[PDB]
């Protein structure tokens, strides 16, 4: 699962969970 | 526990240990969870409520071979306990139980074996549906 | 109080409370236990529950948790919050539908020599087989076991601290008297 | 500039709550109790269960915390969380539920001089024996009693607070306007005191404690008309 | 919402909750207290207790808690957990048998001025006198005393935002009708 591990530190790098995800300012 | 310290810090400190992965050499593979239940006591089954609560314990047997060691490296230890939260879990619960209680009770401390077994038996209050013939 | 600080970062610096608190791993630690009866709060002889509040006091040494107290200011104990350290993980295998191990974490006391004294409060709602044969005038015998869930007795072992529970301190209960209790 | 952020970082950017406000091992802590009960909830007789809702007001004094309002733009109070601050953990002693903690953790006020002040609000349920000989014609002696979970007599001291005038309250102190009778049960007599015991050799470090006795008598109205 | 990611590391740098969010200590805080109530879920004669849910919207503005939206792609709101931020501390002061204070963290919301808005729900259980004279065609007047439980009016100001509770989202009740209602 190192393959798993790498992907997952590279995902939440810098991913803030309280902000909503939005592509763009403005967008639903 | 020059040993056992040492043991913990070689197993999670140096190797990196990551409890969110599970125990598999690639993803596609599935981790055996082998479970057995041992019930202490039948406490009641109440009609009106249609509800079962019994106190169980509930063996779970698995295999993580990154917590693999050799005993006579670490002064002949063949066994440590360890807080359940230091290692991946596989996460069971009651599917059918009644009041929101979907986990054990006391997460008490896994057993790991120098072969790479991770034995623990949490014990656990379950409130479970049980639909009731009166007839 | 700047000596008790610097104590406790000195004691808690490279502590692990996973690892027992003995200084080989082939020793056994020695824990005291020794129970205190304030309350029985119920009988219920439906589902055959006594419900009771104790006391379970626990006594070990900690061999890391050592400090002279001539190089601290002359501190010779301390409070420490025992979420912080190693603990015997004792449970009530007869529990009937209440908590299996202790949930209120408080403060031990901590001697100099390594002392421990660990003196949670708890509710036990213990399984006890209710003869119902002579009621009224029924006579229960009813049991609490408690012993270390995960540790066996090669590398933990338990003894009692007196012959019988300590009731010193046991409210007088409107419903029953207990004539005669012993700890084995 | 808030001089309140710069006060909270003197104070408190070595601080350790942990340890007792004394300058040496062997000094007491004073501890300055009142006990304010706003409303008795109910007493169960099934289950002997004294229901009261209370507030408790608890000073004393921390050297660490002293300061000086010249040095800080005038301050005279800082709110911090309870968390931040030593407590003398106090709790009742004989509730029934396992409750032994207040039920909201307010913020602790501290003083210009190391004055700390802190006021929860509590919902306790304690035990009480029912003396069931003149029922529904009865009245109760319910206790309540304070001490602190972790500290001995000799490390933590309890002193009763005092009014304007100087006078002890040594009792459950009750605000008139805002108390509400309990539909069955009439408060009578608060009396507390201050107990020390276990102070002997063979016993060893001596305890205290603080108990209120409320005497509370049973308004029959319901038992009469309809039983 | 990069730019929001950006803002919010921003905001939460080198901010404290613990003290009173005003520019100078000599200012008061200006809160606006507005209750709703959703649900008379219970009067109970015996105990004298009044079972309400609610909804304590409360309103004030963050000097701290400010940026231009052109520096940050035009983001004029936000919503931000509540926990991370300072409160009032709200408490029903004649709480019968339930909860002091607010235990619903819901999230708040900030808008680039500063102002917040947070509108948490609660169960609250009030002590109320109950006059059962008139019973079954007995009317009640029950209350809910709400203040800062530590702080004072010369650091902390609260205000109604309206003088009649907001009753638009108000579940019909089966057992009672609100003939008035009003805020002082
Ligand atoms: C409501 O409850 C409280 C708490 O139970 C109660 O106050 C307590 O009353 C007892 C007496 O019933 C007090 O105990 C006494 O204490 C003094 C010393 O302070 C002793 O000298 C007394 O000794 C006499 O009684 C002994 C009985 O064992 C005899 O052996 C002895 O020879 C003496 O005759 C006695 O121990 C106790 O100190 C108080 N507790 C307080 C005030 O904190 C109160 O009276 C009750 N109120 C009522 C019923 O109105
Ligand atoms: C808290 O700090 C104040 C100063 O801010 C202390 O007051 C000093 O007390 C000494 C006597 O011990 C005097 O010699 C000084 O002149 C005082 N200073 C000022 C500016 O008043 C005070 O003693 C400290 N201790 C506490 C806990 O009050
Ligand atoms: C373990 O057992 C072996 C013999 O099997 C012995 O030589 C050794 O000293 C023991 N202890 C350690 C530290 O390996």
Same mark, same amino acid.
């Given at each position: 699962?190192?393959?798993?591990?790498?992907?997952?530190?590279?995902?939440?790098?810098?991913?803030?969970?309280?902000?909503?995800?939005?592509?763009?300012?403005?967008?639903? | 526990?020059?040993?056992?310290?040492?043991?913990?810090?070689?197993?999670?400190?140096?190797?990196?240990?990551?409890?969110? +992965?599970? $125990?598999?050499?690639?993803?596609?593979?599935?981790?055996?969870?082998?479970?057995?239940?041992?019930? !202490?006591?039948? =406490? /009641?089954?109440?009609?009106?409520?249609?509800?079962?609560?019994?106190?169980?314990?509930?063996?779970?047997?698995?295999?993580?071979?990154?917590?693999?060691?050799?005993?006579?490296?670490?002064?002949?230890?063949?066994?440590?306990? +360890?807080? $359940?939260?230091?290692?991946?879990?596989?996460?069971?619960?009651?599917?059918?139980?009644?009041?929101? !209680?979907?986990? =054990? /009770?006391?997460?008490?401390?896994?057993?790991?074996?120098?072969?790479?077994?991770?034995?623990?038996?949490?014990?656990?209050?379950?409130?479970?549906?049980?639909?009731?013939?009166?007839? | 109080?700047?000596?008790?600080?610097?104590?406790?970062?000195?004691?808690?610096?490279?502590?692990?409370?996973?690892?027992?608190?003995?200084?080989?791993?082939?020793?056994?630690?020695?824990?005291?236990?020794?129970?205190?009866?304030?309350?029985?709060?119920?009988?219920?002889?439906?589902?055959?529950?006594?419900?009771?509040?104790?006391?379970?006091?626990?006594?070990?040494?900690?061999?890391?948790?050592?400090?002279?107290?001539?190089?601290?200011?002359?501190?010779?104990?301390?409070?420490?919050?025992?979420?912080?350290?190693?603990?015997?993980?004792?449970?009530?295998?007869?529990?009937?539908?209440?908590?299996?191990?202790?949930?209120?974490?408080?403060?031990?006391?901590?001697?100099?020599?390594?002392?421990?004294?660990?003196?949670?409060?708890?509710?036990?709602?213990?399984?006890?087989?209710?003869?119902?044969?002579?009621?009224?005038?029924?006579?229960?015998?009813?049991?609490?076991?408690?012993?270390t869930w995960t540790y066996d007795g090669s590398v933990v072992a338990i003894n009692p601290e007196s012959?019988?529970?300590?009731?010193?301190?046991?409210?007088?209960?409107?419903?029953?008297?207990?004539?005669?209790?012993?700890?084995? | 500039?808030?001089?309140?952020?710069?006060?909270?970082?003197?104070?408190?950017?070595?601080?350790?709550?942990?340890?007792?406000?004394?300058?040496?091992?062997?000094?007491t802590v004073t501890i300055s109790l009142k006990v304010t009960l706003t409303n008795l909830i109910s007493?169960?007789?099934?289950?002997?269960?004294?229901?009261?809702?209370?507030?408790?007001?608890?000073?004393?004094?921390?050297?660490?915390?002293?300061?000086?309002?010249?040095?800080?733009?005038?301050?005279?109070?800082?709110?911090?969380?309870?968390?931040?601050?030593?407590?003398?953990?106090?709790?009742?002693?004989?509730?029934?539920?396992?409750?032994?903690?207040?039920?909201?953790?307010?913020?602790?006020?501290?003083?210009?001089?190391?004055?700390?002040?802190?006021?929860?609000?509590?919902?306790?349920?304690?035990?009480?024996?029912?003396?069931?000989?003149?029922?529904?014609?009865?009245?109760?002696?319910?206790?309540?009693?304070?001490?602190?979970?972790?500290?001995?007599?000799?490390?933590?001291?309890?002193?009763?607070?005092?009014?304007?005038?100087?006078?002890?309250?040594?009792?459950?102190?009750?605000?008139?306007?805002?108390?509400?009778?309990?539909?069955?049960?009439?408060?009578?007599?608060?009396?507390?005191?201050?107990?020390?015991?276990?102070?002997?050799?063979?016993?060893?470090?001596?305890?205290?404690?603080?108990?209120?006795?409320?005497?509370?008598?049973?308004?029959?109205?319901?038992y009469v008309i309809n039983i």
């Open positions: 699962s190192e393959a798993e591990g790498r992907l997952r530190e590279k995902l939440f790098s810098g991913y803030d969970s309280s902000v909503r995800p939005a592509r763009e300012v403005g967008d639903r | 526990l020059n040993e056992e310290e040492r043991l913990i810090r070689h197993l999670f400190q140096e190797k990196g240990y990551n409890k969110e +992965l599970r $125990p598999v050499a690639h993803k596609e593979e599935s981790v055996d969870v082998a479970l057995a239940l041992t019930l !202490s006591n039948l =406490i /009641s089954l109440k009609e009106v409520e249609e509800t079962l609560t019994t106190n169980v314990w509930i063996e779970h047997g698995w295999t993580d071979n990154r917590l693999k060691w050799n005993a006579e490296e670490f002064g002949n230890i063949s066994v440590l306990r +360890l807080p $359940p939260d230091m290692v991946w879990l596989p996460e069971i619960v009651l599917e059918n139980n009644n009041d929101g !209680s979907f986990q =054990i /009770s006391y997460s008490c401390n896994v057993l790991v074996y120098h072969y790479g077994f991770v034995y623990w038996l949490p014990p656990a209050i379950f409130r479970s549906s049980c639909p009731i013939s009166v007839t | 109080s700047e000596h008790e600080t610097r104590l406790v970062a000195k004691l808690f610096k490279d502590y692990s409370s996973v690892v027992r608190p003995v200084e080989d791993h082939r020793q056994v630690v020695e824990v005291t236990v020794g129970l205190q009866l304030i309350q029985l709060i119920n009988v219920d002889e439906v589902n055959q529950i006594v419900t009771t509040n104790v006391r379970l006091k626990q006594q070990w040494v900690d061999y890391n948790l050592k400090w002279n107290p001539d190089d601290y200011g002359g501190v010779k104990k301390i409070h420490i919050p025992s979420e912080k350290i190693w603990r015997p993980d004792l449970v009530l295998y007869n529990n009937a539908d209440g908590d299996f191990a202790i949930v209120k974490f408080t403060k031990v006391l901590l001697q100099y020599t390594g002392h421990i004294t660990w003196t949670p409060p708890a509710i036990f709602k213990s399984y006890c087989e209710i003869i119902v044969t002579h009621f009224p005038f029924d006579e229960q015998n009813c049991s609490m076991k408690l012993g012959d019988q529970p300590d009731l010193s301190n046991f409210m007088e209960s409107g419903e029953w008297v207990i004539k005669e209790s012993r700890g084995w | 500039k808030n001089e309140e952020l710069r006060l909270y970082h003197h104070l408190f950017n070595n601080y350790d709550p942990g340890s007792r406000p004394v300058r040496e091992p062997e000094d007493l169960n007789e099934k289950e002997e269960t004294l229901t009261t809702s209370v507030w408790i007001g608890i000073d004393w004094q921390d050297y660490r915390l002293n300061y000086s309002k010249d040095d800080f733009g005038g301050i005279e109070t800082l709110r911090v969380p309870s968390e931040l601050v030593w407590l003398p953990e106090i709790v009742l002693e004989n509730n029934i539920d396992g409750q032994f903690g207040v039920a909201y953790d307010a913020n602790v006020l501290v003083y210009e001089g190391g004055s700390v002040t802190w006021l929860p609000p509590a919902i306790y349920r304690s035990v009480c024996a029912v003396e069931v000989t003149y029922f529904p014609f009865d009245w109760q002696n319910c206790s309540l009693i304070f001490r602190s979970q972790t500290y001995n007599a000799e490390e933590v001291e309890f002193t009763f607070a005092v009014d304007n005038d100087g006078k002890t309250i040594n009792k459950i102190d009750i605000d008139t306007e805002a108390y509400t009778e309990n539909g069955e049960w009439a408060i009578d007599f608060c009396p507390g005191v201050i107990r020390r015991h276990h102070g002997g050799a063979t016993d060893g470090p001596g305890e205290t404690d603080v108990i209120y006795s409320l005497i509370i008598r049973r308004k029959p109205l319901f």
